[PDB]
């Protein structure tokens, strides 16, 4: 029954792995062992590093920098897994070194910093901001606001207000286009990134943002669901990394194809379907993506055009790709959905220098597929 | 702050162990390893045994029987630790072999059964019923009702109705006295057992029972809180195992002293204080209990009169005693409260033939002291 | 019943701590131990110092000066606690060194002196004057006038006459604006300080001042009650330290926010409600303040804007803040009111260099919450 | 101004709660939530039960019967709160099962019936008849007559004719004594019940009864006002439940003291004063009743002799008592009147088995104190 009802309305979540016949005990051990390898382990698989007695960061092992993407992912993992200490350490590093107080992007977070905290950029990444906002709202709901900067719900609503209203009475740009209600790739650009579209997040912003903005967020939820119809290829289901507002790929700088960023689209559709069960098209799109990857070996994943033509270049993050295709099974049924999940179940967390993006997607999938990626409601 | 505010009102819980300076990682690992030892390990410390495809039971290792006390305990542990498969296995066994459909106690659960399911008794134990009811209400809120017998909220409300209304139209007696609002030792006896008094449970029955009974449950909550002032000794804080309605010890069969049953009183005061912070006297009482035991070595715990005079007979369950005194620290503060907790932290789970009662109390204390014994709200 | 009736009309006072379940004996011991630490103790917590054989002063430990605020507080504590010797010593120091006989503010008391008695100022603080006046009237009623300057009732009526009539036939200003009947921040300024508004004091001045001024005092009582509706924020209940006559914050010099002075507003509402039960809005306002501070740790209290936004700067007097929120429970009911009182009950008097303002507020709260902050009627 | 002017003459009503400083929004919310709890909620506080497609009844939760008192009360509540569907359901049940067509009391309504409709009596209660008549006249004015039995004004005038003229041409007795113009306890008894005396109702019967009876009703209004001077104790203001025509208590069967019935006297004086402001003595009497109870705690209310001596027996309906004393504030002013109202404002609706009489009086008081218990003029 829960396959067809949004978890938002019921407060109950599918444990897809248990449904599929993996043991409840083994599922719990896999999740806990994965947490420990990523947040309490060593040079083998770790993506989180404590620093001092009140801070910590998520390290892009491949680019040797700290990004808002990973920091916001870390906060979302920490609030889903109920570790406020890790959450607060990450958020503290973020406010101290990444929050921007001047320039055109004041009120946003610099997307890239060095592990020492020195700025590598003066612009934000909207996917980090929207994860920061929802993680903080969840943290406010699970644990309660504390004193600034750990006044989580206030930080989230203030952030979300900036995302919509910047540039109204200043020299900057908002992160959502006010006309088509679509999130942008960056504030200063009039195109988008399909994997940034989180209609399930905007449904929640439409309940918990400052009241005046809730109408906008509700239309952003519906606009983003419709937009993904344009961005996903009608045969393969594959979306480009960057795209214009009409869904056509933006290959200005090589981002017009199916590569690392776009892997998240399938996972987002799975999570939106589980949380809100709002657009039956999502099931058809996930069906197309899983069919495309059914005849493919992870060890040979490539860059592909959205129509499915392979490049010579192999996938940089094949474990991340198979994890997102597994998470998409929340919106799928049949043997290919079970096969995507079985591949993921039999795939260990990544090690080596390129493990950071793979391992973030891996933990997200495991949380979602075990019934542990939830909407944390106000108390 | 949370020390002074009932968690019911805030939805926020103290992690006392973390407050006291035990590490968050170590705390979680201790809870997880304790669960494994009791519910997934071997005959060294195990208290839970699966049976067939869909059943399981909590075994009293000492008396070689299945008791409603242990079953209801295992159900509460399972719902607090979010393991519905264990919960459902225990509840299925209970309904199948323990639920009485005939005789004077129809609608109650036979308190004692053989491990194969044969009845050893035809009367209930009220402390089991009240744990069954609250655990089922928590299961209904955490996971949602399934179909009979797993229609959790319906089973809970029907059980609570029997507890109050039995004996109106037929033979039998209710489990609460209608005049003084106090829970009875058994339905057919006009005396009580201080450790059965769970005002924090009755606050919740006052919200979630059938509507016509909610006034009574609210009165029961206040009456039980005041009753414990009579039952606990004014110097030592010690309550007897059985007591009359005026609080004086009932030593008709040797139960008028401080022994196994009575250990739970300090734990109950700690949990009531944390959940509702309703009666400041509870912190004075826990203060006296911890003062009585602060100087005593667990390997020499005895039966005591409530005025504190020792018997020669040793305590049957010394680990259970120290665990309840640690859990009581939720209502205490200062040096003796931290010492009770440090003794508990450094005490391993019990092994051998008498382990069952100690290990139940042990896990309850670890759950409560880690902030994981919560009120699960509707949804 | 006494919750809804003014103690002025009945002559009976609520012992809120006893109502709440703290022991009558323990309440009395806490009050007496607190008195001794503050007035008969040592460098640890003392705020009162005898000097010579007939004088003594209250020392602002943080600013190492003698202030009419503290002196008048000391006299009010001494008359409530029935120690005329301490009262007369403080009053003697006050008349000898602080009473002004020349300049524009003649007839007022210099607000700040050094412990040796040398003037640090030539202007008054109206909150000291109104406490001097009521304490002296209470002293006249409890003990009887003695010879000047201990002719208490005459000193009080003469002081109150100056407060209203100065500047009529001279070059100075009164302490109450004659048009809006509101107390001013200082005689020479046309704005106010919300914590100076003591409508419960003016009700008594309207009975015991010189007869010609009693109509004014009665109108000041109702004007101040209405004024607090403007000064307290409609969501948080927080008042600014300084405000204009229309209630909006006066942030000329940083006093526009919720900080040390404003803590007293909640306590004043609690005391007015207990004494006169005149304005039901007071219960709603105290409800808002207690709700604001419910999710807050005293160790992390900050300066806040009246809308509740935190500054980085911590509260200088967090014990004073929690004591005033506890005293406000005289105008509140429910679990948050009991929680504010339990936090205060479990908070020791302050030590160290900043203890003076905290400890004055602490003793006031303990007197009020034990039923010992009373209206002393003429004999 | 409206304190001194009868609302009949002006069409204007005091909202006493708003005058006293309770918020207009909160006042309306309290009335609306009280209606829901009593007429639309569940077994916790409900007093009204629909039955079938066109019936409903007010249940005496204590005596497990349907009484004309409660039915007539529910009809008055429904017409004041503008819910014709509830009104018509109650009136239909009344006509169907309680209207007597045979015997000595034909034309009256049997006062007591089982919830299924079986007669438990064959005599009426005059307090029911007079409420039936006025509520039906208000229904005729608010909504307009429908057809029998919902020809409201005709049913009312025919009922009032029976009340005066029964026993002229046949067996039976009228409900008013024709010589002294006073309502009787029952038609066949020459004594009265002070709480049945509703001069403010008879003023309206004097305008809207059949024309030949209007002189009598005007005389009844004046006679009832003067009679209450005899029935209320000159010191306490307390009236007995039953009394002779000279006002002295009738304690033939234990009804000569201040108990449940008599509570309504203070309410009736308050409503008569607000509607007609006809007898200044009513303010003195309410003054004495509020003085008697101002110092008493509701949880300790007793039966009292009319001179105020307490019995050991507690009041059956303490919430009803405090609600009537609050409603009496329509005829009082000063500190004790506001205290009675604040106690009522802070008293929740009653729950449990004895709630019916308390909750009827509660809603009447809330209606009256919010300015919503009005005279509904022709249309």
């Amino acid at each position: 029954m829960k396959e067809h009802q949004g978890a938002y309305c019921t407060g109950t979540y599918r444990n897809l792995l248990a449904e599929y016949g993996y043991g409840e005990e083994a599922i719990q051990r896999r999740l806990d062992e994965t947490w420990e390898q990523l947040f309490e382990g060593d040079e083998e698989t770790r993506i989180y590093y404590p620093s001092g007695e009140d801070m910590g960061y998520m390290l892009d092992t491949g680019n040797l920098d700290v990004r808002t993407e990973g920091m916001s992912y870390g906060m979302m993992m920490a609030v889903q897994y109920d570790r406020q200490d890790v959450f607060d350490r990450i958020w503290k590093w973020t406010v101290t070194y990444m929050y921007m107080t001047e320039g055109d992007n004041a009120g946003y977070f610099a997307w890239s910093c060095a592990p020492d905290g020195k700025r590598l950029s003066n612009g934000p990444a909207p996917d980090g901001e929207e994860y920061f906002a929802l993680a903080l709202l969840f943290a406010s709901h699970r644990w309660g606001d504390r004193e600034a900067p750990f006044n989580y719900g206030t930080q989230a609503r203030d952030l979300l207000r900036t995302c919509l209203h910047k540039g109204e009475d200043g020299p900057g740009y908002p992160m959502w286009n006010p006309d088509n209600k679509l999130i942008k790739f960056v504030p200063n650009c009039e195109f988008s990134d399909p994997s940034y579209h989180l209609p399930h997040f905007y449904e929640l912003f439409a309940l918990w943002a400052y009241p005046e903005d809730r109408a906008f967020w509700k239309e952003a939820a519906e606009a983003s669901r419709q937009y993904l119809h344009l961005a996903c290829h009608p045969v393969t289901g594959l979306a480009p990394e960057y795209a214009y507002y009409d869904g056509t790929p933006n290959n200005e700088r090589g981002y017009g194809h199916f590569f690392s960023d776009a892997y998240r689209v399938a996972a987002n559709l799975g999570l939106d379907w589980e949380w809100f069960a709002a657009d039956p098209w999502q099931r058809e799109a996930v069906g197309k993506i899983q069919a495309f990857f059914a005849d493919k070996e992870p060890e040979d994943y490539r860059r592909y055009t959205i129509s499915g033509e392979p490049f010579e270049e192999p996938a940089l993050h094949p474990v991340g790709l198979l994890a997102t295709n597994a998470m998409a099974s929340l919106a799928a049924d049949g043997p290919q959905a079970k096969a995507c999940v079985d591949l993921f179940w039999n795939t260990p967390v990544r090690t080596g220098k390129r493990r950071y993006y793979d391992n973030c997607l891996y933990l997200f999938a495991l949380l979602a597929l075990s019934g542990n990626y939830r909407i944390w409601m106000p108390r």
Side-chain angles (χ1 to χ4, degrees), chain A residues 2-24 26-28 30-42 46-63 65-103 105-167 169-251 254-296 298-299 301-337 339-352 354-379:
Chain A
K2 298 176 301 186
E3 194 191 84
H4 323 286
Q5 324 167 88
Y8 168 72
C9 295
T10 63
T12 68
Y13 297 81
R14 190 152 63 266
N15 181 339
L16 197 54
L17 289 165
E19 295 208 333
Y20 278 15
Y22 306 88
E24 322 253 4
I27 292 154
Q28 275 301 136
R30 191 62 78 72
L31 183 51
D32 298 328
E33 285 166 348
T34 301
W35 175 263
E36 299 187 67
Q37 291 193 267
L38 275 47
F39 287 82
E40 294 155 13
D42 45 43
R46 77 209 162 198
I47 59 177
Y48 162 81
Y49 299 76
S51 99
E53 281 245 350
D54 53 356
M55 282 182 1
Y57 54 86
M58 314 277 294
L59 200 277
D60 183 335
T61 51
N63 292 282
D65 66 338
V66 177
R67 27 204 287 154
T68 53
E69 171 59 282
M71 294 299 253
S72 68
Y73 279 174
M75 282 162 66
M76 184 61 82
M77 292 140 103
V79 61
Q80 292 297 339
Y81 203 70
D82 202 4
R83 289 292 294 302
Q84 188 171 15
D85 54 325
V86 168
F87 187 101
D88 283 352
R89 281 168 173 278
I90 300 179
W91 181 235
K92 184 40 132 165
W93 204 100
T94 297
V95 175
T96 63
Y97 295 118
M98 293 184 269
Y99 182 71
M100 289 185 85
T101 52
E102 188 216 281
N105 289 309
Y108 294 141
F109 295 84
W111 75 277
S112 168
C113 290
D116 46 287
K118 183 184 317 306
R119 296 275 173 81
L120 300 185
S121 61
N122 68 339
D127 48 335
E129 259 78 359
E130 62 185 343
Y131 270 86
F132 279 140
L134 195 58
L136 285 161
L137 285 163
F138 285 166
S140 179
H141 298 166
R142 299 206 63 170
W143 306 318
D145 278 24
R146 304 205 305 287
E147 191 35 84
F150 309 115
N151 50 333
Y152 308 120
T154 300
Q155 298 282 340
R157 289 184 296 269
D158 290 350
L159 191 272
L160 290 173
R161 175 187 285 157
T162 305
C163 288
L164 297 192
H165 292 287
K166 180 50 63 165
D169 47 328
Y173 283 93
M175 257 170 200
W176 272 257
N177 175 283
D179 307 295
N180 58 30
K181 285 96 174 95
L182 301 171
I183 190 182
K184 308 136 83 156
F185 168 63
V186 301
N188 280 268
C189 284
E190 298 264 42
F191 66 88
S192 189
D193 182 318
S195 75
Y196 294 7
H197 286 256
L198 306 185
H200 48 303
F201 284 33
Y202 317 146
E203 293 269 6
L204 300 178
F205 298 162
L207 314 158
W208 303 327
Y210 284 125
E212 67 278 5
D213 295 341
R214 301 184 178 168
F216 183 98
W217 285 121
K218 184 63 170 270
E219 329 288 300
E222 174 57 344
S224 274
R225 286 190 183 112
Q226 296 174 339
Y227 171 76
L228 293 176
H229 291 219
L230 308 182
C232 290
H233 191 267
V235 174
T236 67
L238 305 175
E241 285 187 293
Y242 299 172
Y244 301 98
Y245 290 141
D246 61 16
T248 64
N250 176 349
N251 203 41
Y255 289 88
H257 309 293
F258 188 77
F259 212 51
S260 314
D261 267 38
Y263 303 166
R264 294 172 297 203
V265 166
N268 295 337
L269 299 172
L271 193 60
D272 187 38
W273 181 259
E274 166 70 346
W275 279 8
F276 288 96
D279 183 4
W281 171 91
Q282 301 179 338
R283 306 184 61 75
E284 281 235 50
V286 165
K288 284 162 196 200
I289 300 166
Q290 295 191 326
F292 181 78
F293 283 107
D295 80 322
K296 289 196 171 52
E299 259 193 342
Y301 288 161
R302 311 285 189 79
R303 189 190 303 264
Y304 310 95
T305 70
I306 60 145
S307 61
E309 301 146 298
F311 291 77
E312 259 318 308
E313 182 183 6
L316 198 40
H317 306 287
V319 166
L321 177 39
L322 71 89
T324 62
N325 293 332
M327 186 165 153
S329 286
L330 286 178
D333 202 61
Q336 280 178 341
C340 284
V341 171
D342 196 61
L343 198 61
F344 169 68
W345 177 258
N346 289 280
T347 300
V349 303
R350 196 169 186 193
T351 64
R354 273 137 153 78
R355 67 182 184 271
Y356 148 87
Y357 189 63
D358 304 86
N359 284 356
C360 291
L361 275 41
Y362 188 111
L363 187 52
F364 276 149
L366 187 47
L367 284 168
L369 290 168
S370 62
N372 286 302
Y373 199 160
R374 310 196 175 201
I375 298 162
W376 292 104
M377 295 295 287
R379 79 220 175 253

